[PDB]
Each structure stands twice: as C-alpha cells, then as structure tokens.
C-alpha cells in the first residue's frame with residue numbers, strides 16, 4: 270500500500286517494523302510479523318547462548334519463508350556477554366538485517382557492515398542518530414519519550430524529536446515509541462520518518478507468545494498506566510505500572526538508592542515470568558503508554574493490513590477532503 274525509503278531499503282511490503290523485545294521476541298513473534306509483511310526481529314539476548322540463537326533462527330525459518338532480522342541489545346551490565354560470538358552466529362546464519370541498540374555499538378556495526386549485513390540502530394537523540402549515521406548504519410530508529418523500554422534522559426517526545434532528527438539526518442528514519450495504528454503511521458511519515466517501529470502493539474496480537482492475561486492487561490490499561498523506573502540512576506526505563514515498579518519508585522524516592530537496592534525487584538529472571546505465568550505483578554515488564562490506544566487482539570496479518578489501509582484512507586479521505 271505504501272512505498273517508502275524503508276520498504277525499498279529493507280525489501281519488505283509494509284513500512285512497519287517489530288523491533289527488539291526481550292523474552293517476547295521469539296520465533297512465533299518474528300515469523301508472524303514477517304509473514305504479515307513487516308520487518309521482524311528475533312531477540313538475540315533472549316536466547317541464553319550463541320548456539321541457542323542459531324537454533325531459534327532455524328526454528329523461525331520453519332514458520333516463515335520470508336527474511337527477518339535480529340535485534341542485538343548492548344546490555345550495560347558488568348556480567349560478561351559473548352557479544353562477538355552472538356554476532357558471529359547472526360552472520361553465519363545468513364541474517365541480512367540487524368537492529369542494534371545500546372551504548373557503543375560501533376564495534377558491532379563495523380563487523381556487520383564488513384559482511385554485508387545492513388544495520389538499523391535505535392537511538393534516543395539526534396546527536397546519537399548522527400554518530401550512528403557517521404558510522405555507516407543503513408537507517409536509524411528514533412525512539413521518543415513515549416516508548417516502552419529505554420527512552421534516554423532527554424525526555425523529548427516523537428512530535429518534536431522526529432522532525433528535529435529529519436532536519437539533520439540523511440539515511441532513512443524509523444519512528445519508534447507511541448505508535449499503534451494508521452493515524453500514528455501518517456503522523457510519523459509527515460514528520461519526516463519513512464516507517465514506524467512498534468513493541469507494545471505487537472504484545473497485543475494473537476501470535477505473540479505470551480500469557481493471555483498479559484494481553485488482557487494491555488487492553489485494559491490506559492495511557493497513564495506506565496512508570497519510569499531508575500530515573501535516579503540515569504537508567505530510565507518505561508514499564509507497565511504494577512506493584513513492583515511502584516515499589517522501585519518508593520525506594521528511589523527515599524534517596525541514596527543504588528542499583529543493588531533494586532536488582533532483585535527489576536530482575537530479568539523475575540520479569541520474564543510475567544509473560545510466561547501471566548502474573549503481572551511477579552516483576553518488571555515493558556509496556557508503553559500507547560497501550561491506552563490498544564483494546565483488541567488481531568492476528569498480525571490483519572493488523573498490518575488495517576494499519577496501512579487506515580493510513581491510506583486518512584490521506585485520501587480525511588486530509589484530501591480538507592483540501593477540497
């Protein structure tokens with residue numbers, strides 16, 4: 270329906286991407302999005318070892334014959350992670366596109382480039398997107414304040430961050446954070462982006478491999494039901510508001526709090542159980558304020574189809590109508 274610099278550059282049907290999703294970004298998710306016409310990604314670090322990732326890629330290929338990418342998130346953790354080996358596994362597997370995120374991606378970007386693997390780098394500021402562009406990425410994903418996950422510390426929403434980035438960048442731009450439907454798509458495109466990336470919206474789909482209680486929580490949640498944890502540590506993350514995030518906020522409020530004082534609460538091992546068991550209070554789980562615009566659970570195929578058709582109608586009916 271839409272042809273943009275994004276669809277042309279990455280060879281996909283729709284200007285819609287399903288970026289990194291720790292714990293959730295497995296074969297079922299990626300295959301559903303790939304089969305739906307969008308740019309899908311398997312979460313590399315969701316797999317416990319480079320070998321596990323190779324196997325997951327194979328499993329995904331059994332569910333879809335269409336190409337998909339892999340997200341490589343650079344954890345600021347101190348516990349050694351065989352990043353180099355994960356990269357090697359991604360390349361050896363024939364992956365043609367990778368979405369990198371985190372600090373100091375340079376080393377990985379260069380390696381991927383040497384092997385003809387395109388790179389999309391998720392950034393939270395214009396200065397970061399520019400540095401990434403100078404490093405040679407194929408596109409930049411501009412994550413705004415609205416996003417689930419790490420929005421950085423500048424607190425600039427997409428309405429301003431996107432045009433600000435479009436004013437300076439040359440490579441294609443992917444808008445990320447706060448998008449869920451055709452209205453968001455058109456807004457993103459008008460602001461200077463060539464596609465939209467979504468996370469929360471994909472949690473609320475039939476194929477997303479998570480407990481039905483989580484999908485129900487997203488539908489029931491309004492736009493004001495998310496918390497920004499670890500702001501006092503300059504490691505801000507937007508998560509679903511629950512007993513855990515609220516407790517983390519209480520701890521930070523007391524002042525003099527360090528990561529060690531919350532490591533047990535924000536634990537990833539604890540958060541992954543939210544998606545598996547469906548207990549939304551077991552731990553911290555990512556969700557964006559965009560949940561307030563979500564109240565259904567379509568199959569990924571119809572979802573993407575409806576988004577582009579809605580966007581098309583907004584242009585040809587609503588907007589052109591105002592001009593007539």
Ligand SMILES: Cc1cc2nc3c(=O)[nH]c(=O)nc-3n(C[C@H](O)[C@H](O)[C@H](O)COP(=O)(O)O)c2cc1C
Pocket residue numbers: 288289290291293312340342369370371391412415416417418419445446447448466467468469470472554555556557558559
């Ligand atoms: C459950 C969940 C897990 C996520 N995991 C990661 C991750 O491991 N790495 C990363 O760079 N972004 C991660 N994200 C962020 C998304 O890739 C995307 O940038 C964000 O969801 C966009 O905001 P939206 O939720 O409003 O669409 C995650 C988001 C969700 C909802």
